[PDB]
Design an enzyme around this catalytic site. Structure first.
Site, mmCIF file in Angstrom:
data_model
loop_
_atom_site.group_PDB
_atom_site.id
_atom_site.type_symbol
_atom_site.label_atom_id
_atom_site.label_comp_id
_atom_site.label_asym_id
_atom_site.label_seq_id
_atom_site.Cartn_x
_atom_site.Cartn_y
_atom_site.Cartn_z
ATOM 1 N N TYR A 162 0.832 -1.192 0.000
ATOM 2 C CA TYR A 162 0.000 0.000 0.000
ATOM 3 C C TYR A 162 0.871 1.248 0.000
ATOM 4 O O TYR A 162 2.037 1.231 0.406
ATOM 5 C CB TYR A 162 -0.993 0.026 1.172
ATOM 6 C CG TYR A 162 -0.414 0.324 2.538
ATOM 7 C CD1 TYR A 162 0.049 -0.706 3.355
ATOM 8 C CD2 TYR A 162 -0.381 1.615 3.031
ATOM 9 C CE1 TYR A 162 0.558 -0.453 4.639
ATOM 10 C CE2 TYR A 162 0.148 1.897 4.322
ATOM 11 C CZ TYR A 162 0.615 0.847 5.110
ATOM 12 O OH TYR A 162 1.117 1.118 6.365
ATOM 13 N N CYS A 163 0.273 2.334 -0.466
ATOM 14 C CA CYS A 163 0.930 3.637 -0.502
ATOM 15 C C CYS A 163 -0.097 4.672 -0.069
ATOM 16 O O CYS A 163 -1.082 4.348 0.601
ATOM 17 C CB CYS A 163 1.497 3.924 -1.900
ATOM 18 S SG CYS A 163 0.211 4.026 -3.145
ATOM 19 N N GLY A 164 0.119 5.934 -0.464
ATOM 20 C CA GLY A 164 -0.822 6.979 -0.096
ATOM 21 C C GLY A 164 -2.199 6.802 -0.704
ATOM 22 O O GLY A 164 -3.206 7.161 -0.087
ATOM 23 N N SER A 173 1.783 2.099 -5.110
ATOM 24 C CA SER A 173 1.878 0.686 -4.741
ATOM 25 C C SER A 173 1.626 -0.225 -5.933
ATOM 26 O O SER A 173 2.153 -1.340 -5.971
ATOM 27 C CB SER A 173 0.901 0.353 -3.615
ATOM 28 O OG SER A 173 -0.448 0.584 -4.026
ATOM 29 N N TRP A 212 -3.659 4.320 1.834
ATOM 30 C CA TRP A 212 -3.808 5.003 3.115
ATOM 31 C C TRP A 212 -4.978 5.983 3.117
ATOM 32 O O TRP A 212 -5.672 6.134 4.133
ATOM 33 C CB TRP A 212 -2.488 5.706 3.392
ATOM 34 C CG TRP A 212 -2.369 6.524 4.621
ATOM 35 C CD1 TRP A 212 -2.200 7.865 4.678
ATOM 36 C CD2 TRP A 212 -2.283 6.046 5.966
ATOM 37 N NE1 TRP A 212 -2.060 8.279 5.985
ATOM 38 C CE2 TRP A 212 -2.097 7.172 6.798
ATOM 39 C CE3 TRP A 212 -2.378 4.778 6.551
ATOM 40 C CZ2 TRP A 212 -2.004 7.070 8.189
ATOM 41 C CZ3 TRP A 212 -2.277 4.677 7.937
ATOM 42 C CH2 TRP A 212 -2.098 5.814 8.738
#
Ligand SMILES: [Mg+2]
Ligand SMILES: [Mg+2]
Ligand SMILES: [Mg+2]
Lengths: 250, 251
Positions: free
Chosen positions: B84-86, B91, B113
Site C-alpha cells: 500500500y501507498c498513499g 503501490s 492510506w
C-alpha cells in the site's frame, strides 16, 4: 557429530510436544517447485550461517528472535518455518514464538544435518547476488544516458552545469550528506512530483543515488513519461566519494 | 491530504494496474481484525510519511529502495505480499516491478492510506510500538529468577571476590565488538546446548548478561528449567555497565 546432553533434550522433547514439525523433504520440494508458503528462518548463530544456508532462508538467530520478531514480523498469523543445526534448537524457537501468539509456526525436523545428509542444495553467503535487481538495472542502463561522477563534478566545478541535479535517495540518506546544491526528490516520489517540478520534459536532468542503480531505474521511468534529456550518474555517490569529490550537509 | 496527480504519472499507473492484482482496504481490515492476514503487508511510502502513522501489521519497504532490497529481505519468490501507498498508485507501480522480477504473488491495496482513513479504520503511530509479547516474556522470566546489579558484579570482579562463571549471551558480532573483561561468550542461542558440558555442577554460580538485561533473563529462566539453581542475570545488561562508566575489553 553432535553430542547433545540429556537436560537440553528434555527441553526439546517438551517443546516438540506442542509444535508442528515438517521434513527437510517438504522444504526441498516447496523450494524446487517455487511453492514455499511461509518465511523460512535460519535460527543458527552468525558463525554457522556464514558457512552456508538453505535456499530461500533469512536469518533470525534463536538468541535474538524473541526480541526482534514483533518488529520484523508483526503479523501473528504469518506462517514461518524454522530450522537449526539438527531440528532441536528450532523446536525451542517455534515453541517460544507459539507462546508469544505466533501459532502458524513449524520446525524443520532434522535441520541442517538432515538437509546435508540428503545432499540437498545449499547457498554460501559469498554467493549471494541480487540477480533480478541487477537485471532490472542493466535493463534500464541499456535505455538511458549515463555520465561519470568526474564529468558531472568537472561541469559543476567549472561553472558549466547544464542540468538540474536530483538526489533520488531516501530522506535519511539525503539528510546525512548530498552533492552540494542537489535537490532531494526520492525515487519513491519522483514520478508523482516530476511534472509539477519540471514541466519542460526536454529539460536536462541528472539523477544520482548511492550506486548508479536506483538512479538508472528512475531515469528509465522518467523516459516512459516523455522526459528526453535525463542522465543517470554512473557509480552514484559511492563512486563520487571514492574520487574524493566533496559532499555537503544542510 | 488532497492529491493533484499528473496525467503522465497516472498513465504509468494505469499501465501497471493492468498487470497486477488489487484488493480493497476492506480486505486488509477484515484480515487484520480476524487475525487471518496471509501475507506480508508492506508500506511503500516515504520515511516522512510512515512517521505520521501506518496500517496495523505493516512493515516498511519504501518504493525507492524496494527493488534493491527485496531479494535479500524476502528471498522467496512465492511469498505473498500486499503493498500500500498513499492512494493506491505508487503501490501498483511497486507490485508491477516486483512481478517483473519474478515475485508474482503480489497484490496492491486499491485506494491505499487515503481510503483506509476515509473509512475510519484503525492506525498505529511509530511511537505507539512496543514489543509487548517480548516484554511479557521478560517479566515472566524476571518473576522467577535472581538478578544483581552491574555495580555488584563490577565490585566483585575488582575485589577478586568473583564467585561465579560469567557468560555473555549476546550474538557473535556483539561479543566481538567488546565485552566485560574475562566473560566467556555463550550466546543465548547456544546456551542450553552447551551449558551441561561447560558447567556440569548445576549448583555452580553462573552470571548471565546481555545488552539490556532482557535476553539474559530469558536465558536464566531456561537454565532453571534444566535444574541450575544458582543463575543470576545482570540487571540492565552491558548498557547499564557502560552507563556507570565501567570499562570493557576487546579480545
Ligand atoms: Mg521497463
Ligand atoms: Mg516459561
Ligand atoms: Mg575476552
Amino acid at each position: 557429530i553432535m553430542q547433545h546432553s540429556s537436560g537440553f533434550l528434555k527441553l526439546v522433547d517438551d517443546a516438540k510436544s506442542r509444535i508442528q514439525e515438517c521434513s527437510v523433504d517438504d522444504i526441498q520440494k516447496m523450494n524446487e517447485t517455487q511453492t514455499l508458503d511461509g518465511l523460512l528462518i535460519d535460527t543458527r548463530e552468525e558463525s554457522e550461517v556464514a558457512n552456508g544456508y538453505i535456499p530461500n532462508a533469512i536469518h533470525l538467530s534463536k538468541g535474538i528472535i524473541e526480541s526482534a520478531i514483533e518488529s520484523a514480523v508483526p503479523n501473528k498469523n504469518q506462517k514461518m518455518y524454522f530450522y537449526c543445526g539438527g531440528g532441536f534448537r528450532s523446536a525451542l524457537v517455534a515453541d517460544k514464538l507459539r507462546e508469544m501468539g505466533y501459532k502458524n509456526v513449524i520446525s524443520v525436523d532434522g535441520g541442517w544435518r538432515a538437509w546435508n545428509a540428503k545432499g540437498y542444495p545449499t547457498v554460501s553467503p559469498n554467493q549471494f547476488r541480487p540477480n533480478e535487481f541487477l537485471k532490472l538495472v542493466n535493463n534500464a542502463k541499456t535505455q538511458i544516458k549515463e555520465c561519470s561522477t568526474t564529468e558531472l563534478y568537472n561541469k559543476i566545478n567549472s561553472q558549466e552545469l547544464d542540468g538540474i541535479v536530483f538526489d533520488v535517495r531516501e530522506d535519511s540518506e539525503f539528510n546525512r550528506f548530498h552533492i552540494q546544491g542537489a535537490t532531494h526528490l526520492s525515487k519513491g516520489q519522483i514520478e508523482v512530483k516530476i511534472e509539477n517540478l519540471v514541466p519542460n520534459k526536454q529539460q536536462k536532468i541528472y539523477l544520482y543515488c548511492g550506486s548508479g542503480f536506483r538512479s538508472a531505474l528512475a531515469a528509465e521511468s522518467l523516459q516512459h513519461m516523455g522526459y528526453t534529456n535525463v542522465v543517470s550518474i554512473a557509480g552514484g555517490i559511492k563512486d563520487w566519494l571514492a574520487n574524493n569529490y566533496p559532499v555537503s550537509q544542510n
